[PDB]
Subunit: 150 residues, 12 copies
């Protein structure tokens, strides 16, 4: 019930995160494009993997997942802007960092709610996902010359 609600929140937020990553992939310009351009692709595939798992788990529990663009946009707490080629590489990576931080926090909130309802399966899905998102936070901040700062 609370588990079901935090899973459906992730469905919406992950759908918007994929969209933002695709924008970064497409509009990227400046030194470093050749390594970071295909890298967004690895990220998008990971994000799709979570989206699928969390949504299907919600179905499995008796819920009804968001499944239209209007529902993703309106329920998600991530905000989107028009694509723009002039944004710098380093500005682009900082933005991925801020999306990833929000997802880490969402997944913690997911861990907590599922733990207090005893839904162990859902609990595990959130923990695995938070684990790899935080490793990516380490790597992105290191590219930018910074500590991870979780």
């Amino acid at each position: 019930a609370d588990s079901k609600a935090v899973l459906n929140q992730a469905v919406a937020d992950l759908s918007v995160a994929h969209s933002i990553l695709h924008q970064v992939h497409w509009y990227m310009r400046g030194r470093g494009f050749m390594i970071w351009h295909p890298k967004m692709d690895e990220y998008m595939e990971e994000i799709d993997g979570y989206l699928d798992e969390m949504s299907e788990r919600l179905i499995t529990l008796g819920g009804a997942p968001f499944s239209t663009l209007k529902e993703f946009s309106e329920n998600s707490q991530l905000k989107e802007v028009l694509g723009d080629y002039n944004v710098t590489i380093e500005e682009q990576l900082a933005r991925v960092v801020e999306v990833f931080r929000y997802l880490a926090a969402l997944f913690q909130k997911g861990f907590d709610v599922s733990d207090e309802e005893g839904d162990s399966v859902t609990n595990d899905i959130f923990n695995v996902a938070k684990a790899s998102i935080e490793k990516h936070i380490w790597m992105l901040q290191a590219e930018l010359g910074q500590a991870p700062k979780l």
Copy 2:
């Protein structure tokens, strides 16, 4: 300058984003005999759709353009309509819905071919031809499962 080629590629970026969301809905809310075949089949169709989306968008970037890249833009520029998920829709109704989405994409890809042909954009022209070919083969197979002719 390729004004209309660019424009139909962007129309295709929006339309493919919405088509993808509609196949995901079908994939999730599917119930009834034939689930075990058609549930994973939707995975294949989404992957194919994602391929065209990426290729058509990158061709647009390649020509000097600016692809749609936010959910708001996809949804306001697409000619496809979304309704709320519902588990009570039959299998046959689900497949007929995919046929309609595919019939639309095929005619969109046809408009894409004609427009690029006329502007001398052979590369773009070929992307639209390859995509149409495959969407039309799917329409044959889906129609067949439903005991019908392709009626292209």
Copy 3:
């Protein structure tokens, strides 16, 4: 670790019988849908086999003695076997696989509880991973039958 051991061993028995019923369904299946559901019971049996061996080997690791005869499998399992019957419909055969899975999922839930109480987190992970996967199977089976997972 007396009760983690007890339930690990219970699983060895129920999973042996669960494997036998899946095999029956695989052999005696008749009706529209056979060609997709026949090889699908193969995938289920292989996954049941994986659990059988991992739970058993965890029980040895903890210093116990796993059930290892058809006799022990029979008298300890709470699953009930009947004679093979070709005249059972496809839908009824899938409903039967649903029952067996629902039972296994409940078992793995107990196993999870007792391991968590006794401080055995290795065995706790084992039970959780296997529950996740069987519950995904129950959704898909019930969807084929036009129904909700109803967990």
Copy 4:
């Protein structure tokens, strides 16, 4: 080895026609089950092609001359072809394949008997292996259609 050579050539003709009938079912199929049975037709086609080549090549190896034109396939085969038709039901299409397979299985048995008598053990095994796998498909096809194999 006169009757072994003659029976291999018969198979070359009948397998060529069986191939063509399967191709027709693949193309003209409509209705529920299309998505599983349409590609399944390709698997049978590939399997049929393998027998065709083994049997033909064995006939060559023994100093024979295989049928190698469409006219020869048509006039020497005991199988009958009809015009393609999109209106036939899936269930009718599958029973048509059971029929072709029933004929091939019996032909392969004549193959086995005639070569056992003449002591051509190599040709004997070729027909045995092929009969084994064709009877297995008759079970599965009939099981889909709600029936016993009735070999």
Copy 5:
């Protein structure tokens, strides 16, 4: 799109006969070069089969009805078949394959033109891709025979 449907169906028949001829060459080959040219006939067969399925399924897609019996293939095809013969030389065998390929390339060109006039751009592409590859083979086969391609 009346003419596109007809030349697709013509190709179905002619490809079917081309297959049979390639297979006769494969089987009846003798002389220096056998070891290289016998397996090569397999590759051309796999490629001719690819054309046949792609073109037939395009016709179904457009609302047509493919030829699907040996009888229809023989009667509609323009290629003549003859009885198999071991005494034919390697040079003669390869020359015959060249003749068949020249024919198919001329048919694919006509197919290209008709579909172009009618606006069927997908059929246009199938015919073009197939023409490219057959032409390339004619070059290699002619080169083996000591000749320019002479398209």
Copy 6:
């Protein structure tokens, strides 16, 4: 007849699977690291015969054993409680013994089907017998012995 001996094998193959699994689990002594996963390859091959033999019986119009009750009651092999104290040598000699029984059973399967003219079934028993016999050679060799077929 052929149907009767196919069903017998279904039964005996199910108990022999259970016995290999026992050896696999309870094994202790020098040679564990090689023989423990070797029992895995044996069970796989045993599972292969089982599935092929049941399916042939279905194909012939038969009705295969499909309960632990039926396997255990129809098999001529006997099971005992698992014991950690058995020796590596004693464990391999049990396997040898189960394999000798299977080779004789497959023999009967060959003779019976051959006399009935069911050649497909005849070949199934022949292939299975060949491989089990090869296994008896190797196991026996590990234990310092001739195959003594």
Copy 7:
């Protein structure tokens, strides 16, 4: 009859041979930050360029032609100029030079598209189109690295 198609195929054989030598130089003489990405990337470009050369040369043979097949022939017929290897060229400059060659190649493939179209040689037409497609996509990526639009 097909004399202009032949002559443009052979022109490409000369130009591609020289383009392969220029990529090799860049590969070898490269120095500066980003070397570890861009050095192996020249290898991928070299394999692509080798694929077109061999395909366009064999199509010329298939048509009745006689391809250029000596360094002297390649050098005298190519419109590309070569200079001496120099380690002191910067990374930006090397990447800029590859863009120059890629732009020339894309325009030559376009001319090849045109000529084969006017002669009725649809097979040769296709070979140029497929090659143009992928060279233009590379011009997009390289210019992105350099902070620029594709400017096709």
Copy 8:
């Protein structure tokens, strides 16, 4: 061991030392069983290296600073090394690995409780997976030595 950052760093030092001990055994082994156990020490070293990298990287992600010099590994580790000796027997070599593994399973449990108390669930899972596998290796190692695992 104050917190999660502390026990991870401890794991870094102990895994570096355990790797070196396993390499010693790999190199100096002698006696019946060499051909099996010599390569099996590579599998262990690789598994060890795996955990080393996971834990080290989690400590960095968390804002820490892993030990990265031999002196640091040597001084902080609780395991003790001795000069390589060819006159150690196979069985003694195996028992030393068991000793090293038993220490590691204990360090992993400590890391489990400490992370569990802090709410650091990610570090909790990393220590749980590592313990699961180490303990399985102790069952097998002991079984070769004629003993129960005795965890």
Copy 9:
């Protein structure tokens, strides 16, 4: 019971060993048009000969016998004759010599087949049958290269 089956198995151990040695000679001393197809082909033949050698020997061990295992036992028990290698033999004659070795082996495998069928050794019977099937097929192809019928 199984003395004769056991005797023919070992006969084959010797013959397969000499046959292997003869193929290695042909492979080494081969000169002439076709070298580049037939030199590697000899390796495929050697690997197939080794396959029968190991299988037939192991079947013998399995039945309680004792396989020949010395070049002396091989060379005295074999019915095949060897001669010094010669570079001046033609391609067509090396291939004809291979043919003769194969003809002998197939006759032997028929003797093996007959002997084993009479003693009710159904396993040994199958091994000989399978080896005969493949060797006879090579005979067809080799004779086809040389412009002849198989003439089994």
Copy 10:
């Protein structure tokens, strides 16, 4: 050619022209044996390309500057090129490849000697590996032509 660097650079230029000559043989080839020797030219070219890249990168590693224009390749190489000609027989084409391989083998021996004299042992091994496989190829090529290697 007075040092290791000068012979590497000599090799860069000679390998580039050797590549060009092999490409010409590949393209202008006609006659019996085309089908085996046309794609063999490909394997020869890929191997030549590996030597080129390796010897050039060795030069850079030693502080040199490899030739890197067609002008520089053409002027520094002792190999001569002629216009392509379809009327050259197949056996004549193979003889030309032998001729180029005999030259390359001689160059590599000079490279071996020079580098050995200077203690450039890494360079020395590069020339040795390359000589070995070229010489093997001369053996096979001459064997196709009914001749001893005559190295």
Copy 11:
């Protein structure tokens, strides 16, 4: 370092330290280029481990006793280790790697010199193959840093 056995063992010591230093660079790396050079360090580490195992095993094979404790590695190596530091630039990190690799190249020259002198040709090769690839990495690293390799 008077003989082959002693320089091999010095190699065992320095290669263990090399590995520890590369691992540091891997972990403490920060700045533009992190995403390419972080994984590259793993490639170097893996290649160092290979040289370790080969050089160590050769020593054993000749009848010596490899250093096998962190103590022995650290005392016998000529390489210095400092504490981990996130605030080093990418250019400074790759500069440290170069210096380490130059040292290793020079050692392998000593191993080569000493083994040639003693006529142990096997050990000679191992040092030669390892010198080859380390030198190649130096060129690439120096190129990234805008420099000639300056061996």
Copy 12:
């Protein structure tokens, strides 16, 4: 080059006999360790065959005429063969594999010495690579037997 040629052909003869001796060990083996040492004999036979093939072809490439009959192998080889005996223990069989390998490593050293004196550096390299891996196998076989390599 006469002596290089002479020792290549001696190797041809010795490697043929070694291959014969290993197959015997493989076949006649009985006792604890059979299951690991029986397949290990296949790996050694394969590596032997590779050496045999390389050394014979190098001889052919040099102008030579390798031994190619069983009689030539038997009478030129310094290895002696004895009748197969199932009673030899596992430890005796491995000791017999050791003696064969000791002879081969020594034969390869004189191959190395002779080709070095004649300046045949390709032949020199082949003997060196072979000696390296054989001597590695002596270490491993002596370890199983609880001994030092004692080269």
